[PDB]
Chains A and B, each alone.
With several copies, the nearest count.
Chain A
Amino acid sequence: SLQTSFVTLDEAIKITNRRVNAIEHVIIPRIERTLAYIITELDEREREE
């Protein structure tokens, strides 16, 4: 009962530690440099005005 719950646990840890590292490294660094592009492009609409 502790062997079948052991090998199914690290099967569900690798699918979670990848989904955490898919957010910290692919999704959030794509949003935080999208938001860095909005502010530099909204500063240029103010100088043109």
Chain B
Amino acid sequence: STFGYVHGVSGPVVTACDMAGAAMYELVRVGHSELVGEIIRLEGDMATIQVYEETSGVSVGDPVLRTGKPLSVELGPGIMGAIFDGIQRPLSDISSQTQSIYIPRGVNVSALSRDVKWDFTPCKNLRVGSHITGGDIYGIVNENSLIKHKIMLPPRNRGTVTYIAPPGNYDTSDVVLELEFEGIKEKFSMVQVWPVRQVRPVTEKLPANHPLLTGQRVLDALFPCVQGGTTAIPGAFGCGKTVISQSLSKYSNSDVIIYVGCGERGNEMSEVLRDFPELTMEVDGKVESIMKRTALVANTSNMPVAAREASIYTGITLSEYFRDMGYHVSMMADSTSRWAEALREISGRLAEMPADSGYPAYLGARLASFYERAGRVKCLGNPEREGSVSIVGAVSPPGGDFSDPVTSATLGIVQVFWGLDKKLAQRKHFPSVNWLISYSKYMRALDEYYDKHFTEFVPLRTKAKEILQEEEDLAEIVQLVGKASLAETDKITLEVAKLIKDDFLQQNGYTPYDRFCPFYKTVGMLSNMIAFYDMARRAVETTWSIIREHMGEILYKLSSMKFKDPVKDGEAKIKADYAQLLEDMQNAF
């Protein structure tokens, strides 16, 4: 059969009858306006469905149109620069088709429009008669100037090519590839439909070795992240969250970005949806907009609670489809604390047992089964590509306390934590990443890259970490007894720590010279500031005063280092100027 009838609605939940061949967690369309809901129980012929939309005016006997699939995304061209909700309805098309400001509760508008034409070209290896496995790229759609949309096979099916398309412009409904198999020949277009709860298959997990060049100086040096890794940041009101989310989209080596705003707010999501279309990317030629490589999943809390719980799985499935092409995806879940409040309402409506602070029993397992979808892996398919997914999930704990069933379960799964602080924003220290509470566990896998490319960076930062760790025990005694009892060895390492927090860590994002500090500038700005430290370690073992008053101009040359603009200043000049500062310190001592 194909139709069911309603037989009773008691709120969001509909106990639809006459549905015998219905599967569990399969999406249906309830009512005359076709409200979307999923089958959540199945008692014989009746199927108990909870509706995503608002049931109001749904009669007994309305048709329940079965689809036959779980909650799934449409993967194909027309996705870059598009804004979806958590269940992938196009917000930029709903506001254009209907000419209104509301979501009309019955829109089964397709996520990818079937009216635009895409310039398709085949892989030029595939002929009529070739055997093809799942994951093989059989075409490339030049979607933008930046992104080449490699049309791939679905991982499910397999067969032999009997009809390939000629090079030309097609819709997303035109048949492009046709595959003979044992029983029946299958034909399918450029769009593939993959369930969002199902992990994408892949050949082999690889270890993560290459770092993410985020652009900031404290994050690329002291607490480094790898592409293929999982991080976490505190999601407070204002510490630094707007510039960590936007410098990682402008100034990173990641090929595509997916930004998942997951039930955020009314005006805090309208701020994001109007600031990301007006960002600018500096590619090797001319300037470009960031929305040629960025997709957004936008959810306010007026939206359905199951379109807020499945926003994370929509975002990670778009991040995994662009991983399998060979790109290096970076995904930022804007809030995972507002996602776990969408689990508590889903489980609280099903009368599930609360585990801890109201959250359900499967909270720590659903967070682990999402963060373990991130990693640099070797993709499927005979073209022999590799991809990556990096996940930056922000956590907004109640009251800023790190003891919570979501926050303490995030810190046990993520490896990197960039601890943003409220107090460093009140002292105008930008970016406000704290160094004591932060950590990074990818350092042991990043030495093999650092010994082949920079080779004087690994012992450089461990000296910079023990200086600032020494400063916190020195800060309690400067008000206790004072600097009058402070040692000649300890008063110098306090004075280079103030040089560290002013020159290396503090980085103004609106100045045109420090918007993107590359790692050649980053290794230079610390190698001339740690070499200043240990030559000041033997200068007290031979006077603290005469090194501060006579080298005050050398104190200025380190305090105008961050100014050595690398956009308009060559790399080899900056290396040349940094070597000249190294000789001035070795000659003055």
Assess A/B contact in the complex (Cβ within 8 A). Answer: yes
Are B357 and A48 in contact (CB-based, < 8 A)?
yes
Contacts of B356 in A (CB 8 A): 43, 48
Tell yes or no: A19 within 8 A of B by CB: no
How far, in whole Å, are A47 and B351 apart by their CA atoms in the complex?
Answer: 12
List CB contacts (< 8 Å) of B352-369 with chain A: 353-354, 356-358
Task: Give the number of residue pairs across the A-B interface with Cβ within 8 Å.
Answer: 11
A18–chain B nearest beta-carbon distance, Å: 15
Contacts of A46 in B (CB 8 A): 354
How far, in whole Å, are A47 and B360 apart by their CA atoms in the complex?
Answer: 12
State how many residues of chain B have any CB contact under 8 Å with chain A: 5
**Can you list 11 residue pairs at the A/B interface with Cβ under 8 Å?**
A43-B354, A43-B356, A43-B357, A44-B357, A46-B354, A47-B353, A47-B354, A48-B354, A48-B356, A48-B357, A48-B358
How far, in whole Å, are A47 and B353 apart by their CA atoms in the complex?
Answer: 8
Contacts of B354 in A (CB 8 A): 43, 46-48
A44: nearest chain-B partner, CB-CB:
B357
How far, in whole Å, are A48 and B353 apart by their CA atoms in the complex?
Answer: 10
Instruction: Give chain B's interface residues, CB within 8 Å of chain A.
Output: 353-354, 356-358
A27-49 Cβ-contact flags toward B at 8 Å (1 or 0)? 00000000000000001101110
State how many residues of chain A have any CB contact under 8 Å with chain B: 5
A32–chain B nearest beta-carbon distance, Å: 11
B379–chain A nearest beta-carbon distance, Å: 45
B403: nearest chain-A partner, CB-CB:
A36
A17–chain B nearest beta-carbon distance, Å: 10
Contacts of A44 in B (CB 8 A): 357
Contacts of B353 in A (CB 8 A): 47
Beyond A43-B357, A48-B356, A48-B357, 8 additional contacts (C-beta under 8 Å) are A43-B354, A43-B356, A44-B357, A46-B354, A47-B353, A47-B354, A48-B354, A48-B358
How far, in whole Å, are A43 and B358 apart by their CA atoms in the complex?
Answer: 8
How far, in whole Å, are A44 and B357 apart by their CA atoms in the complex?
Answer: 8
Top-4 shortest CB links A-B = A47-B354, A43-B357, A48-B356, A48-B357
A45: nearest chain-B partner, CB-CB:
B356
B345–chain A nearest beta-carbon distance, Å: 16
Contacts of A43 in B (CB 8 A): 354, 356-357
A36–chain B nearest beta-carbon distance, Å: 9
Contacts of A48 in B (CB 8 A): 354, 356-358
B358: nearest chain-A partner, CB-CB:
A48
B402–chain A nearest beta-carbon distance, Å: 14
Contacts of B357 in A (CB 8 A): 43-44, 48
A45–chain B nearest beta-carbon distance, Å: 9
How far, in whole Å, are A43 and B356 apart by their CA atoms in the complex?
Answer: 8
A46: nearest chain-B partner, CB-CB:
B354
A44–chain B nearest beta-carbon distance, Å: 8
How far, in whole Å, are A6 and B353 apart by their CA atoms in the complex?
Answer: 65
How far, in whole Å, are A44 and B354 apart by their CA atoms in the complex?
Answer: 10
Contacts of B358 in A (CB 8 A): 48
B353: nearest chain-A partner, CB-CB:
A47
List CB contacts (< 8 Å) of A1-17 with chain B: none
How far, in whole Å, are A48 and B359 apart by their CA atoms in the complex?
Answer: 11
How far, in whole Å, are A46 and B358 apart by their CA atoms in the complex?
Answer: 10
How far, in whole Å, are A46 and B356 apart by their CA atoms in the complex?
Answer: 11
How far, in whole Å, are A46 and B354 apart by their CA atoms in the complex?
Answer: 9
How far, in whole Å, are A46 and B353 apart by their CA atoms in the complex?
Answer: 11
A39–chain B nearest beta-carbon distance, Å: 9
